[PDB]
Design an enzyme around this catalytic site. Sequence first.
Site, PDB file in Angstrom:
ATOM      1  N   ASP A  87     -15.341 -13.114  20.143  1.00 38.53           N
ATOM      2  CA  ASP A  87     -16.197 -14.224  19.740  1.00 38.53           C
ATOM      3  C   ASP A  87     -15.456 -15.550  19.907  1.00 38.53           C
ATOM      4  O   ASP A  87     -14.376 -15.624  20.501  1.00 38.53           O
ATOM      5  CB  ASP A  87     -16.703 -14.017  18.310  1.00 38.53           C
ATOM      6  CG  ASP A  87     -15.584 -13.953  17.275  1.00 38.53           C
ATOM      7  OD1 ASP A  87     -14.400 -14.143  17.628  1.00 38.53           O
ATOM      8  OD2 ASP A  87     -15.895 -13.706  16.091  1.00 38.53           O
ATOM      9  N   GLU A 116     -28.788 -17.394  20.734  1.00 42.45           N
ATOM     10  CA  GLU A 116     -27.397 -16.956  20.692  1.00 42.45           C
ATOM     11  C   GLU A 116     -26.990 -16.093  21.875  1.00 42.45           C
ATOM     12  O   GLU A 116     -25.870 -16.229  22.370  1.00 42.45           O
ATOM     13  CB  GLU A 116     -27.127 -16.196  19.388  1.00 42.45           C
ATOM     14  CG  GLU A 116     -25.683 -15.773  19.192  1.00 42.45           C
ATOM     15  CD  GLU A 116     -25.360 -15.501  17.736  1.00 42.45           C
ATOM     16  OE1 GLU A 116     -26.092 -16.010  16.862  1.00 42.45           O
ATOM     17  OE2 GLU A 116     -24.377 -14.779  17.466  1.00 42.45           O
TER      18      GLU A 116
END
EC number: 3.2.1.17
Length: 466
Positions: free
Chosen positions: A89, A80
């Site tokens: 995000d 990630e």
Amino acid sequence: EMNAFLDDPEFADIMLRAEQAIEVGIFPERISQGSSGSYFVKDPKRKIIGVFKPKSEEPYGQLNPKWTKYNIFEMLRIDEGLRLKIYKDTEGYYTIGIGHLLTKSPSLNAAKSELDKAIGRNTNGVITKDEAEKLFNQDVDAAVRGILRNAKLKPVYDSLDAVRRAALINMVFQMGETGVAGFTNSLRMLQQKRWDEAAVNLAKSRWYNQTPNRAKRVITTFRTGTWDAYKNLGRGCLIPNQGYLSEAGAYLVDNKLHLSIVPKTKVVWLVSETFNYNAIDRAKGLPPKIGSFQLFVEGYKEAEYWLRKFEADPLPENIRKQFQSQFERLVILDYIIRNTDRGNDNWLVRYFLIKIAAIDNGLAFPFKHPDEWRAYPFHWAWLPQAKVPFSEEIRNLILPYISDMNFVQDLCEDLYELFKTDKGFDKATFESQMSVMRGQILNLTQALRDGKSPFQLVQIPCVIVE
Ligand SMILES: NC(=O)c1cc2c(N)ncnc2cc1-c1cccc(CO)c1
């Protein structure tokens, strides 16, 4: 005597004392803190004379004794990514660390308030790597609690070993409990320890098709139960398991430019029973280990410690000038070698009334520029000092060197003679490394030419010079 052909008589004296100490039973002492095998080398008088980092005990070396390196935080760091500054995000919400949502609110100050609550201090939107890991492990505990409350996932989780549990948690982070619950046959096969059959139906999914690289690592982890799928990835831009050459290369660049911030570091060989050897070697008389040997410094602390002090208690002007010139030398060293892992804890400050020591130079000299400039930024560029333009002093010292073709050619030849030591040396890959370095040198030459600052230097687009 493996070290008979060193090019530094003063350094060769240090190595002789190290070997004499080992011959009398004063062995290098393994350091407990790091994520790899590093050793305090002693002289016959039990005085620390250097730090030794064997190639085989590097973070992903086959003989690294620090098994805590392989954990879920490092797994998700690869899959990630880790960010130490607040960002937005995929769905537009403020986030920090490894996908740790701070707030759904569009207000930035709300995100900082929540961040200061979670971390426990006034962060101003920037945290340390350790703080991110603590925050991540709190998310893992929350994810595990949800898994144990889920009727479809809890029996599978209980049956899984520690390594395979991390793989299951990895899937939960990416797609949620409901998404993982849809792998009906794979979950049953995993609970029956039919790994290959589970892998077949894990690969027949949207997950495998949308993020094949991450999915393949996770699926392989289910098959083997080991961390082998996450070893020697080189962050996507580094030659795997060549930290010892990067450590020695950083000093080599330092010495050519007379930066004098990297302590003398050389590739040497050492024999010591305190090293981690396989069963065969120990029963035999131990084979020497190749690695980087760096001279010991004293009185230093993490730059994060002194930087926070100076923010609340600014340095006097004369000392501040000295610190900035030292900081400029760090910037030039990291930029030329394209250090990928210089955090504000990986460089040290002693408080020449103030001195910088550049250590942990093992993750530099990439063969390509990173695809994500946000993935491996120069963390000293986030400091206020990075916006001070390069002093006239540093430009008169560096520009004459890096603007001369013979100096650049000699530096590339010196790095070639050093990097060819490794068993996995590849000529084409090395030429990629030098093309990246020449691009860094080109941008640095322009930045010093235009009087830019370290903050402006890192904004110039990366380029390679063929
Ligand atoms: N390059 C290093 O690894 C290093 C080099 C040093 C030197 N030349 N002189 C004095 N102290 C040093 C300490 C470290 C060091 C850095 C990070 C973490 C740890 C273990 O807690 C040790």
